[PDB]
Amino acid sequence: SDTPLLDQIHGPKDLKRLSREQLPALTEELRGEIVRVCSRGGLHLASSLGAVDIITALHYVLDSPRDRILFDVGHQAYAHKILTGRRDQMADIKKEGGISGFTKVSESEHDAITVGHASTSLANALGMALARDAQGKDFHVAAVIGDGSLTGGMALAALNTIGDMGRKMLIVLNDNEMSISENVGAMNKFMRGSVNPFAAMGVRYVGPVDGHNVQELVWLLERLVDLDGPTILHIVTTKGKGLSYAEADPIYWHGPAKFDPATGEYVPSSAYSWSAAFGEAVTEWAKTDPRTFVVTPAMREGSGLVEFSRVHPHRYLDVGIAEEVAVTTAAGMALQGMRPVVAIYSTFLQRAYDQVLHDVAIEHLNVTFCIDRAGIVGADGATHNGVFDLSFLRSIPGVRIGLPKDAAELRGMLKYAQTHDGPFAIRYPRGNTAQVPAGTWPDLKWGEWERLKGGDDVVILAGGKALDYALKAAEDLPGVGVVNARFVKPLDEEMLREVGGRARALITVEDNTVVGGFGGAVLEALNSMNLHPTVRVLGIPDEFQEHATAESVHARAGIDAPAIRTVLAELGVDVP
Amino acid sequence: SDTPLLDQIHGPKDLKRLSREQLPALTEELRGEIVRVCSRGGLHLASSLGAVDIITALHYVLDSPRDRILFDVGHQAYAHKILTGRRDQMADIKKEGGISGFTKVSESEHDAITVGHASTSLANALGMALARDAQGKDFHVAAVIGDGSLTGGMALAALNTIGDMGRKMLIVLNDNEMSISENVGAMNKFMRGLQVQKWFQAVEAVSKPSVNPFAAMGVRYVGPVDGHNVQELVWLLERLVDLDGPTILHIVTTKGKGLSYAEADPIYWHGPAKFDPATGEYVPSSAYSWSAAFGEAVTEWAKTDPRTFVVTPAMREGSGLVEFSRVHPHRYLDVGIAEEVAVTTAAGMALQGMRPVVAIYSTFLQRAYDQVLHDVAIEHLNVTFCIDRAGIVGADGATHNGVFDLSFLRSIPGVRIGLPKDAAELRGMLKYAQTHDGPFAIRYPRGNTAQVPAGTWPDLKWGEWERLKGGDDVVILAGGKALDYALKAAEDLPGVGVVNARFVKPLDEEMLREVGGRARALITVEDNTVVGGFGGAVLEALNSMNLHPTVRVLGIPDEFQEHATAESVHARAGIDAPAIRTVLAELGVDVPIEV
Ligand SMILES: Cc1ncc(C[n+]2c([C@@](C)(O)P(=O)(O)OCCc3cn([C@H](Cc4ccccc4)C(=O)O)nn3)sc(CCOP(=O)(O)OP(=O)(O)O)c2C)c(N)n1
Ligand SMILES: Cc1ncc(C[n+]2c([C@@](C)(O)P(=O)(O)OCCc3cn([C@H](Cc4ccccc4)C(=O)O)nn3)sc(CCOP(=O)(O)OP(=O)(O)O)c2C)c(N)n1
Ligand SMILES: [Mg+2]
Ligand SMILES: [Mg+2]
Ligand code: NA
Ligand code: NA
Selection from A510, A254, A515 nearest residue A376 by Cα: A510
Q: Note whether B154 and B241 are same-domain residues.
A: yes
Strand partners, A68: A141
User: Among the residues of A223-322, which ranges form H helices?
Assistant: 244-248, 274-288, 306-311
| Packing angle, helices B339-351 and A121-135, rounded to 10 | 50
3-class DSSP state of A165: helix
Phi, psi at residue B174, to the nearest 5°?
A: -90, 95
Q: Note whether A561 and A540 are same-domain residues.
A: yes
Q: After which residues is chain A broken (C to N over 2.5 A)?
A: 193
Specify the residue with its C-alpha closest to ligand 1, atom 32: A302
CA pair distance B189, B186, nearest whole angstrom: 5
Amino acid identity of B505?
A: K
Domain-ending residue, one of B431, B462, B493: B462
CA pair distance B182, B561, nearest whole angstrom: 31
Q: Note whether B173 and B232 are same-domain residues.
A: yes
CA pair distance A281, A301, nearest whole angstrom: 15
CA pair distance A155, A177, nearest whole angstrom: 17
Sign of CA dihedral B172, B175, B180, B186: positive
Selection from B376, B398, B395 nearest residue B385 by Cα: B376
Instruction: Report CA(B180)–ligand 2 centroid distance (Å).
Output: 7
Three-state SS for B374-421 is HHHHCCCCCCEEEEECEECCCCCCCCCCECCHHHHCCCCCCCEEECCC
Total Cβ atoms within 10 A of residue A62: 21
Selection from B361, B151, B529 nearest residue A157 by Cα: B151
- Find the angle CA(A556)-CA(A559)-CA(A563) to the nearest 5 degrees: 75
User: Among the residues of A357-463, which ranges form H helices?
Assistant: 389-392, 407-418
Buried b (16+ CB within 10 A) or exposed e, A309-331: beebeebbbbbbbbbbbbbbbbb
CA pair distance B141, B128, nearest whole angstrom: 7
Q: Note whether A318 and A253 are same-domain residues.
A: no
Residue pair A493/A446 in contact by the 8 Å Cβ criterion: no
CA dihedral A317, A420, A363, A341 (to 10 degrees): -10
Phi, psi at residue B479, to the nearest 5°?
A: -135, 160
Q: Note whether B412 and B532 are same-domain residues.
A: no
Residue pair B523/B580 in contact by the 8 Å Cβ criterion: yes
Give me the CATH number covering residue A463: 3.40.50.920
Within 8 A of B218 by CB-CB distance, chain A residues are 186, 189-190
Resolution (angstroms) stands at: 2.0
Selection from B480, B404, B477, B418 nearest residue B449 by Cα: B480
Total Cβ atoms within 10 A of residue B330: 10
Q: Rounded to a whole number, what is the distance in Å from the CA of A366 to chain B's nearest CA? A: 13
Q: How many domains does chain B have?
A: 3
Total Cβ atoms within 10 A of residue B533: 29
Residues 6 or more apart whose CB falls under 8 angstroms from that of B270 comprise B44, B45, B46, B47, B178, B180, B255
Residue pair A531/A491 in contact by the 8 Å Cβ criterion: no
Which ligand is in closest contact with the Cα of A289?
Answer: 5
Q: After which residues is chain B broken (C to N over 2.5 A)?
A: 201, 209
CA pair distance A275, B501, nearest whole angstrom: 44
Q: Note whether A438 and A460 are same-domain residues.
A: no
CA pair distance B357, B310, nearest whole angstrom: 5
Total Cβ atoms within 10 A of residue A18: 16
Among A124, A151, A200, select the one facing B348 at the smallest CB separation: A124
| Packing angle, helices A561-570 and A464-473, rounded to 10 | 60
DSSP B336-380: -S-HHHHHHHHHHHHHTT-EEEEEEEHHHHGGGHHIIIIIIITTT
Q: Note whether B302 and B438 are same-domain residues.
A: yes
Q: How many residues does chain B have?
A: 595
Selection from A355, A489, A353, A360 nearest residue A426 by Cα: A489
Rounded CA Rg of chain B: 26
CB contact under 8 A, A358 and B155: no
The HSE-up count of residue A104 (CA atoms within 13 Å, CB side) is 20
Domain-ending residue, one of A419, A446, A473: A446
Domain-ending residue, one of A418, A446, A474: A446
Express the helix, strand and coil content of chain A in percent, nearest 5 each. Answer: 40, 15, 45
User: Among the residues of B435-500, which ranges form H helices?
Assistant: 480-489
Q: Note whether B284 and B178 are same-domain residues.
A: no
Q: Among the options A86, A315, A351, A394, which is catalytic?
A: A351
Residue pair B212/B348 in contact by the 8 Å Cβ criterion: no
DSSP 8-state symbol, A182: B
Q: Note whether A205 and A88 are same-domain residues.
A: yes
Total Cβ atoms within 10 A of residue B90: 18
Residues 6 or more apart whose CB falls under 8 angstroms from that of B322 comprise B295, B316
Q: Note whether A550 and A564 are same-domain residues.
A: yes
Within 8 A of B179 by CB-CB distance, chain A residues are none
Confirm whether B466 is a catalytic residue. Answer: no
Residue pair B367/B340 in contact by the 8 Å Cβ criterion: yes
Residues 6 or more apart whose CB falls under 8 angstroms from that of B427 comprise B297, B452, B456, B457, B458
Q: Note whether B386 and B533 are same-domain residues.
A: no
Contacts 24+ apart (CB under 8 A), A256-263: A256/A38, A256/A41, A256/A43, A256/A45, A256/A46, A257/A41, A257/A42, A258/A39, A258/A40, A258/A41, A259/A38, A259/A39, A259/A41, A260/A39, A261/A35, A261/A36, A261/A39
Counting Cβ atoms within 10 Å, is residue B559 exposed (0-12), middle (13-18) or buried (19+)?
exposed
Sign of CA dihedral A434, A435, A440, A445: positive
CA pair distance B285, A13, nearest whole angstrom: 61
Domain holding B3, by residue range, is 1-279
Residue in chain A nearest B554 by alpha carbon: A528
CA dihedral B579, B583, B586, B589 (to 10 degrees): -110
Give me the CATH number covering residue A358: 3.40.50.970
Selection from A73, A80, A114, A72 nearest residue A9 by Cα: A80
CB pairs under 8 A between A and B: 378
Residues 6 or more apart whose CB falls under 8 angstroms from that of B544 comprise A537
Experimental technique, in short, is X-ray
Q: Note whether B452 and B482 are same-domain residues.
A: no
